Amino acid sequence: LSINERITKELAEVEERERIEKQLLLEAERINEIDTLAKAHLSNHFNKEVLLAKGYTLKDIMQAQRRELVRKFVPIEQIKAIAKVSDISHIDGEILEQLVSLAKVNIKLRK
């Protein structure tokens, strides 16, 4: 209690900071597999530098890279089946995550 209570509340603060750090590591993994796909499989014109110069949010950059990768690898029939529509312009989200997972499977089997 008292002194030790406030120090253990600071410990709870440490727990919160560790949770934030783990969330950042998850961001690292996701966004980083996305960036590796983007560099390895997409044109230099879609680089983060030039897109930021054109003035796009980084989330917009990631979703654009994901959509381009899905169009490049995943077939149109698979897009029309999983995403239920041909156009990917409004399919950003969990369905986009499934599509990019399918694209990763496609490139793995392509190699």
Partner: protein, 51 residues
């Protein structure tokens, strides 16, 4: 527009020799180079932006 203009320049350069080969031999071939490996040329392309 800058990247597209560079693409247009390379397209014109390819098309000149394409037309010359069309007139001399009867057929002309222009390869559309994308961000892929030399072995990936066999695989088909669904949607891509050429390099």
């Amino acid at each position: 527009e800058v990247e597209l203009a560079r693409l247009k320049v390379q397209l014109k350069n390819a098309l000149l020799n394409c037309i010359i080969s069309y007139r001399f031999h009867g057929i002309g071939y222009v390869l559309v180079k994308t961000k892929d490996t030399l072995i990936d040329l066999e695989q088909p392309v669904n949607i891509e932006l050429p390099i």
